[PDB]
Each structure stands twice: as C-alpha cells, then as structure tokens.
Amino acid sequence: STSQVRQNYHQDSEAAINRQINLELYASYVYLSMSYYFDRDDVALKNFAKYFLHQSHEEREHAEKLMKLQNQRGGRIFLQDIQKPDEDDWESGLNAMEAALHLEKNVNQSLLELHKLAHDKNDPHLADFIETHYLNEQVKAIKELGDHVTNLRKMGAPESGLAEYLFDKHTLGD
Amino acid sequence: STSQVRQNYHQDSEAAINRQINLELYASYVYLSMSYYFDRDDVALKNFAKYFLHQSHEEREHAEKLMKLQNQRGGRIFLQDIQKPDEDDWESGLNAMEAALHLEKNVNQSLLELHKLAHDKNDPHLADFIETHYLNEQVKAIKELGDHVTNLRKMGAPESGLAEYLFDKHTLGD
Amino acid sequence: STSQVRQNYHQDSEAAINRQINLELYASYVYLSMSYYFDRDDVALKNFAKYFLHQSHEEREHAEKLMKLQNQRGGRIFLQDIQKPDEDDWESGLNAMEAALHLEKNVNQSLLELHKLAHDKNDPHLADFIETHYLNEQVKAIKELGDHVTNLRKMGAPESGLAEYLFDKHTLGD
Amino acid sequence: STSQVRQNYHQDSEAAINRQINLELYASYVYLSMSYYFDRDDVALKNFAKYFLHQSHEEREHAEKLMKLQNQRGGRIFLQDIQKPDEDDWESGLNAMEAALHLEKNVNQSLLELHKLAHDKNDPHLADFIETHYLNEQVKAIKELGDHVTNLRKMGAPESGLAEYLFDKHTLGD
Amino acid sequence: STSQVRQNYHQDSEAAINRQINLELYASYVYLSMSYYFDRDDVALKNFAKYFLHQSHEEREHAEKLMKLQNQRGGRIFLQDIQKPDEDDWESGLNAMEAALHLEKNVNQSLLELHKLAHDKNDPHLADFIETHYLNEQVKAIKELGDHVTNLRKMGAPESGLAEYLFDKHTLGD
Amino acid sequence: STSQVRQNYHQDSEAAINRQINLELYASYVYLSMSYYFDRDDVALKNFAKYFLHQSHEEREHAEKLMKLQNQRGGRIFLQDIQKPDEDDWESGLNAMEAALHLEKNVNQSLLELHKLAHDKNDPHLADFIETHYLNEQVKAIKELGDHVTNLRKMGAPESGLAEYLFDKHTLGD
Numbered sequence A, B, C, D, E, F: 001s002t003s004q005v006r007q008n009y010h011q012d013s014e015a016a017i018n019r020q021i022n023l024e025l026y027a028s029y030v031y032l033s034m035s036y037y038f039d040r041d042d043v044a045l046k047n048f049a050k051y052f053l054h055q056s057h058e059e060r061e062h063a064e065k066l067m068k069l070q071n072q073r074g075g076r077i078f079l080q081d082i083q084k085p086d087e088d089d090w091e092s093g094l095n096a097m098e099a100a101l102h103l104e105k106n107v108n109q110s111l112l113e114l115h116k117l118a119h120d121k122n123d124p125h126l127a128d129f130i131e132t133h134y135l136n137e138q139v140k141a142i143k144e145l146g147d148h149v150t151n152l153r154k155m156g157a158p159e160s161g162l163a164e165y166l167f168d169k170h171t172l173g174d
C-alpha cells in the first residue's frame, strides 16, 4: 500500500534510512558500554563515564529523528536486532577515545553514502535533511575525538595513569 | 538589459520563480476559499475555518519570499492572473482536508521541479533557498494533512457529523 | 435553500458584495506589485516598498471582512479570478502614488454604488456596515495619497531623483 | 580477579543482573517501536505515541540503574544483543496497550525471580534494591495499563476509531 | 601524513579552501583601505567610513571560519601574502560602492566555483558549508551594494556633493 | 596638495607611520597563523589558540589606530602587501611563545625608532601618541611573553607534552 503522504521517496532511500536507524542505535549501545566501563571501581574515571553517557543519549536522539523522518516521508520503520558492542572491556581512556573516533568515521561513511543515494535519487529533501542534521555534527564529533586522542597521547597515555586522571579532570570535567 | 546584481541566475530559473509565485498565490486563494466555507452558518466549524485561514496567510508569505528572491538575484517579477479555486462549496471537513493534501502535493512537485532546475543550472544559491525555506515545510504540511485525513476517516467522517464537530474541537481547536 | 439566517438581504446586494470582494482582492494585488517594484535593485526605495506592502495587506483585510459580512447575512461567496495589475513596471514613486490615487477613487466609487444599492433595497444594516467600515477609510486614503502626490510634485519628482529619495526617508520612513 | 569492593555478592546474582539489564533494554526497544507506530500518517495518534516514547525512555533508565548497581557491587557488565520487538505493526491503540500489559507482567516475573534469588543468597542489599526501585514501579505500571485497556474496551475499541481518538485526547493528552 | 580526522576531503578542495582564505583576507584589506579613505579630512564621510570598516571586520570573520573549516576537515592551512588593494584613493562614495560591488561579485564567483568543486568531489559537507555560511550572504551583500549604487546615482552623485553627504546621513547613518 | 589640517608633521614621520601600519598588520597575521596552528587536531591546545587569536585582533586595532593618526595629522595612508608569516607550522606552544617574544621586541624596536624620529623632528604630539598608546603596551606584552616562556621551560616543555597541556589549562585558560 502506498502512503497518502509519500512523494519522491525511493524504496532504496527508505531501506537506507532503516539501516541508518539501526546503526545509530548501535552507536548509542557502544557508548553506553564505554560509559559504564569507566564507572567500574577499577577504572573510576567519572568524567570519561559522563562524556560517553552523553554521547549515548545523543545517538539515541539521532536514531529517533531518523524514525520521524521515515514516517514524515511515508516510509515504514523496520527495526532489527541491536548487536552488542565488539568489546566488554575498553582498556583505557585513550583506547575508548580511539574506538569512538573509528566508530564516528564509520557512521560518517554511512551518512555520506546515504547522502549520495539521495542525490542519485533526486531527493533534495532527504539530502538537505542529512546535510542539515547529520553531516556537520559528524565532522564536529570526529574533530573533537581527534583533539582528545591527540591530547591523551601527548600527556603520556595510556601508560601514564596520571595523564588519564588529569585529562578526566581538566578536559572532560568542564 | 542585465541587472547589476545578476550573477549565475539562468533565465529559466527566473521564469520558474515567477511561476512558483503564481502557484503560491493560487494556493493562498484556495485556502481563503476553504476558510470561509467553514464560516457559513450551515457549516459552522470555526476551527476548520481558522485552520485554513492560517494556511492561506502562510501561502501569501511563501509568495512574498519568492518575490524577494526574484529581486535579490536580479530577476524581474511578472505577475499573472490568480485563478479562482476549483470549488465554491468544499462539502465537508474531510473533503477539504483531502483537497488540501492534493494541493500541497501539487505545490511540492512544482518545488522539486524548481530545485531540479536549479541543480541542472549549477545554481546552488537557488537550490539551497528552495531546500531551506520550502522543501521541509512542504513535507511537514503534507504529513500533517495526512494525519488529519486519517483521524477524520477513522472517526467516521464525513457521514458522522459528530466526527467533524469533535475533530474541530479537539484537534483543530487547541 | 434559503439560509436560515437570511433576512432583508436582497439578491442584488449579495452579488454586489461578491463583486466588491473581488475588487478588494484586486487592489491588494496592485499594491503587492507596486511594493516589490520598489524593492528592485535599480529602484531601491525601501519605504515606498513598505508603504505599498502595508496597503496590500490592508486591502486583503477589507476583502475578508466582506466575506465575513456575506456569511453573516446568509449570502453565498463566489470568488472569481484575480486579474493581474495593469502594469509590471510602476516607473517611479510619484507615478505609483498617482496610480494608487486613481485606484482608491475607483474603489470608492464602487463602494458608493454599493451603498446606494443598500439604501435602494432598504437594507440599513448593509448601509451602516459600508459607512462604518469603508467610507471614511476611503476618504482618508484618498486624502493621504493626494497629500503624497502634492509633496512629491512640489519637491521636483519624478525628474529630481533627490526628491523621491528624501520623500522616502522623511515622509514614508516616519 | 575479585573486585576490591565485592562483598556478599553471589555469581548467580551477578549473572541475573546482566540478564535483567538486557530485558530492560529490550522493553525500551519494544516501547520505541510502539511509539513510532503511532507516529505513522495512517495511524496518527500523537498521545499514544508520546505515552510509549516516555515508557521507552523510562526502561532505558531502568537498565542504566542496574548497570550502576552491577558496578557498585563489583560485578561485571556483559552486554548482549538487544532483540528486535515481536511486531513491526502494532495494529491499534488497544492492541499496543495489551501487548504492553503482557510485557510488563513478564518484566515483573523476572524481577520477582531476581528478588527470590537475592533472598536465597542472603543478599539483603540486592533484595532491597529490587523492592525499592522496581517492584512497586512494576505494580503501578501494570495497574495503569490495565486501567487503560479497560477504558479502551468499554469505549468500543478497536472497532470504534472514535474511541481511540477520544482516549488519545482525554486520557493520554493529560 | 594523513590527518586522523580526514575523511572524504579532496586535496583539490583543501587547496581551493586555502585560496578562498587568502581572497577573504584580501577583501578585508580592500574594505579597510576604503574605510580610512572616507576618514580623510578632505573626504570626511563618517558613515561611509563606518560602513566599510564593518565590512572589513566581516571579511576577516569569513576568513577565520574558512580556517576553522580547514582544520575541522583535517586539511592544512597555508597562508600567502595579502596583496594590497588596487587603489589608494577611492575617489568618492559612489566609486567605492561600485568597487565594492565588483569585488563582492568576484568573491561570489570564487565561492560558486568552490561549491562546484565540492559537488564534483562528492563532498556534501563542504557543499552545505558553503551554501549555509557564504552563498546567501554574498547575494545579500551584492543586492545591498546594488541598492546603494542606485540611490547614489539617482541622487546625483558623484557630481553632486550634497548627494553623498545626505546619503551618508540618511542611509548609512541608519 | 598640503592638507588643510597638516601642521608640524614631517614627511619622514608620515612615511614611518605607513611603515608601522604595515608592521602591525604583519604582526596581526603572524598571530592569526599561530592561533590556527594550535587549532589543528594534531596540536589541539585550545587556549594557546585563543591567546594568539586575541593578540591578532589586538595588533589589528594597533594598525587601525595608526591609520586614524595618519588622517588626524593630515598625512596620507599608503598600504603595502602584508607578507605571510615566516612559518606555517609553529612546532609547539613554547616555540610559538618564543617566536611571539621575538616578534614583539622587533615591533618595539620599530616604535622606539619612530619615537626617536618624532623627537628629532620636534613633533611632541606624535611622540606623546607613541608613548601613550604603544610603548608601555609593548613592555607589558614583552614581559608577559617572557613570563610564559619561563614557565613553559621550567615545566619541561617542549619535550614533556604534559607541560604544554597543563600550561594551556592553568595559565592560558583563565
């Protein structure tokens, strides 16, 4: 059945949107995992925990806004299993920041391919949606993650436990 | 002779803007007509009337923003007759909502064609103007009209006059 | 079917009211065109543009009030095409003021004939509606447009470009 | 290694907490799916949508509190796949409420089993944690969903689309 | 070596961004020269001076935003000499406005080619960046400078010294 | 033509002012370059970045105040190219601070030469302008840069990246 609102909305776009939803939920789950790793009594970096929890909720928001878009265009949401993150133990603050950087670039890659698909399907509403709500947000996230990684390395992480403690206090704790 | 401001603005784009201006004014007129139909003593659904009156003033703003665009880019406004709406009697709250859904999808198609023209002529300023001020606005309006049609049908409109009364009070009143 | 509210409302009055609605919508379109003429980069008189845009919105209000009247008396609104204005290029500040003066006296003449009809058909509610909401408004607008024409001429418009510039600042910019 | 903070915390309890964490995230996902079903243009019950979205966010908060508890007691969080919900189409407001009632009773059964485990292992901290933060919350949610199912049924849902519209307005649009 | 943040950022885009930075700094320098020309005791048009000083600071801001973009995408900033402006003596208010209009259309052309490059390299983040922060700003500036040129000519500049004096007071003195 | 305001202002002084203007603009540009070096994702010292960006805007004010001086005394501004800075890559917080110290002592030497010129030409207005707005500014800036260099070296910069991180946080960040 075709939705009464659907217009210029290609089935491949609809499917790409469903895959992006699962990917955002996945990213949120990875960040949830990292957050409570820093909450462990044998890690105990509360500002790393808080930073990654904040990222988790932002990713959930990303997924919900894609779900809204799907219904706005008259597509149909099909949710899939949310796979568990690849690690249970994230080793260190630097390691988590590096894993997060890798994650955000993979999510960025998927958004860029979604945008190319919108361009190729002459769907300028979908292209502007990705441009407006996702692309610069990804670029900021990756730059910020790059910055943190750089500082942690220069301070002597992951070896120096002083480095991660001070970075938690002075960069991530306001 | 060429406007001192004109730059990268194709004659076809200038012509299409003039057509969109007339379409927007025509939409305003359709909504004005619907609004005062619901103001009749034998229809008397005041929130339907206010809903379409609001839409009608918004369409006039859409027209005026395009006329400003025409002047910003160095084009020349040529106005045309505004054709009267296709009905005098809009029959029911449900029928008018369906007629509005159809209208908004017609205007959306015209905007997508305009955006495609801008992209074909490598006019990114006009393409972004269309994306930023019109395309998501159309998607939102189409989605809301669909929502309203769905609710009125499910409530038993247009047979059950109880349904249009209660929809006027509880969704359009607010 | 007669309207359950119709009382002392002649068929001729009803049709004259439909004609006046179209005429007010026409005046509104004329003023809209004048306004965006003065917004052109090669005219660039922002307070003339503002002045005419205000008149255009006022004419729309005049039309909607007559549509409301039509329904209050149980007449039936029939809208017609809105004819495009007579000019696309309004030439100058003084020319547009002269054109607006001509238009307003023509609209006034139609209202006077509308009032004469109402008196002929012994419809004092319609007669008072016209006297109250339209007649002194037309007299005021005509007097104001006369004042503007007089000052523009005395300052040396249309020949003197300094004239329209300073009039735009000191009279139309408050 | 044994956590330096671990005390009176049985391995079975630790594992049962990891299961409960997965179950609460699962319930969050079910409610997320229900929410955006009601956002569909062909369902369009915004207060049903808002209600289930609020339950969704609350379940994720339930999950996070259990993750906090695991770390507090020196257990170790192991996340698992979050299984997608059992439907993609939730049929109606009444059917979604009924599915939620059934979900909440299953979540409750697993919390009662978790409490029984805590008592069996003579873990009063965990027993009281469950009583304080989950048991009455489940009982209130189950009671409210039963109230909602009862009202929807007596109003004539799911047959009467009027019933669900008014329930959405008058009970969930609080 | 490659930046840890760089993704989908073509070396051609990187180099065009370095060029655009130098061009913005150049525009800034042109407007600075214009400003203090009007501050001369034998020119003494204080609002022309303020108007151009404000544009000079805006251009510097445009340049720094491009420097920020370069680093966000992981390109590398290379500054070049900032070439002195084409004139030391800007002759008159109208001449400076004509020169500014010419410069802004040149800056605009360079931005349109930047956008075309970003579209060619399938870089929708860069494309949206230019659309969002530069394209309508250029169109607005070009339209405003056109308006100023038109009014100055119409008032009798450059010949009439009264004209530039009064324009300075009534238009540029807001 | 001699300016109607010129009095006791030697052509050598006028020429030296034009050179100081260019030197100040040059200093602004060096600081702009340094600022965005510390904004790179592989450097990422945000308060180093803000510190030098502030110095950049300050140098620009210095240039502008000299340009106003040139006009007040009836001299004529002649702008020259602004040479790009001597480096693209500023290496480290410590290296930049040492380079800034060298730059400020260079600008101070030029101002002392300017002041000598004014005293040699019996231009006490220009001598006092230089004393009041520049000479103590330079001494303060040189003192501050020395202080900063001293602390970075004592903390173990530029080897210990911990030192630049902590200096950026505790000295440069309020």
Ligand SMILES: O=C(NO)c1cccc(C(=O)NO)c1
Pocket: A119, A120, A121, A122, B119
């Ligand atoms: O964005 C485009 N070009 O820049 C584009 C997108 C889809 C189709 C086509 C095409 O094949 N037109 O003929 C072009």
Ligand code: NA
Pocket: C128, C131
């Ligand atoms: Na009267």
Ligand code: NA
Pocket: D128, D131
């Ligand atoms: Na208890």
Ligand code: NA
Pocket: A128, A131, B128, B131, E128, E131
């Ligand atoms: Na865009």
Ligand SMILES: [Zn+2]
Pocket: A024, A027, A058, A059, A062, A063, A107
């Ligand atoms: Zn995301």
Ligand SMILES: [Zn+2]
Pocket: A027, A059, A104, A107, A141
């Ligand atoms: Zn992300």
Ligand SMILES: [Zn+2]
Pocket: A119, B119, E119
């Ligand atoms: Zn394209």
Ligand SMILES: [Zn+2]
Pocket: B024, B027, B058, B059, B062, B063, B107
């Ligand atoms: Zn519209």
Ligand SMILES: [Zn+2]
Pocket: B027, B059, B104, B107, B141
């Ligand atoms: Zn519309």
Ligand SMILES: [Zn+2]
Pocket: C024, C027, C058, C059, C062, C107
């Ligand atoms: Zn009127």
Ligand SMILES: [Zn+2]
Pocket: C027, C059, C104, C107, C141
């Ligand atoms: Zn009028």
Ligand SMILES: [Zn+2]
Pocket: D024, D027, D058, D059, D062, D107
């Ligand atoms: Zn729960």
Ligand SMILES: [Zn+2]
Pocket: D027, D059, D104, D107, D141
């Ligand atoms: Zn629950």
Ligand SMILES: [Zn+2]
Pocket: E024, E027, E058, E059, E062, E107
């Ligand atoms: Zn610029």
Ligand SMILES: [Zn+2]
Pocket: E027, E059, E104, E107, E141
């Ligand atoms: Zn500019």
Ligand SMILES: [Zn+2]
Pocket: F024, F027, F058, F059, F062, F063, F107
């Ligand atoms: Zn200085």
